[PDB]
Write a protein that binds this ligand. Structure first.
Ligand SMILES: CCCCCCCCO[C@@H]1O[C@H](CO)[C@@H](O)[C@H](O)[C@H]1O
Ligand SMILES: O=S([O-])[O-]
Ligand SMILES: [Ca+2]
Length: 207
């Protein structure tokens, strides 16, 4: 099976886009070919769970890319050896850590280095980060940086592709919960529509 790790923070852990992506995989005829991997397996009870849903993920509410890069990622990828890694991180670096864009892209680099050390053929999706309701400018600065980072980092052996979940790709405030940070059902549909097709293409590419 193709092993996929859905790495992230609360936007991965406590949201419902992962079931939608699994549905897409199912619809593509790939549910028997795909194993979602990771240390966590919680899903909120208000999400519409497809039957057969693979609940494993590597989402952690409140965790920062800074910390994950330095303390956790090597363990997680060493334990699971994913073929594909999809992530959105950085929201807590800003809102909790008060870190800048240079910090966050640096932490990206350290995470990707660890993913590749575990698997030099890993295929990676980096998500441009959803906006906060208040259009946090350091989040946008990370988003403006992601394409250059990808250009610097992507290789034929280990491609890095972008799932653009940003303001600029259509993420509206109407897609946020009342806390101004997490996607509501509309934002989950949007997220799943950006990630799911890139993830399906990568799955198909895995040898
Ligand atoms: C720094 C932000 C860290 C994560 C805060 C997560 C807040 C999640 O909030 C929770 O969402 C649930 C639905 O998903 C609701 O059922 C709960 O009542 C609510 O507390
Ligand atoms: O969860 S509903 O507000 O889009
Ligand atoms: Ca699994």
């Amino acid at each position: 099976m193709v092993k996929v790790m859905l790495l992230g923070d609360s936007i991965t852990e406590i949201t419902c886009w992962r079931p939608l992506v699994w549905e897409q995989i199912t619809s593509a005829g790939l549910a028997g070919s795909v194993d979602f991997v990771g240390s966590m397996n919680d899903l909120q009870p208000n999400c519409s769970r497809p039957q057969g849903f693979d609940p494993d993920h590597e989402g952690h509410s409140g965790w920062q890319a800074y910390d994950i890069a330095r303390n956790n990622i090597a363990g997680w990828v060493q334990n699971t050896k994913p073929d594909i890694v999809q992530f959105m991180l950085g929201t807590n670096d800003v809102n909790i850590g008060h870190r800048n864009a240079d910090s966050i892209i640096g932490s990206y680099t350290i995470m990707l280095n660890a993913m590749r050390a575990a698997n030099p053929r890993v295929k990676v999706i980096v998500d441009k980060i959803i906006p906060t309701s208040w259009s946090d400018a350091t989040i946008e600065a990370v988003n403006t940086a992601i394409p250059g980072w990808v250009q610097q980092q992507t290789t034929a052996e280990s491609p890095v592709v972008i799932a653009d979940c940003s303001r600029a790709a259509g993420f509206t405030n109407d897609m946020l919960r009342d806390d101004g940070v997490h996607p509501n059902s509309k934002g989950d549909q949007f997220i799943a529509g950006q990630i799911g097709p890139k993830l399906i293409q990568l799955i198909k590419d895995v040898s």
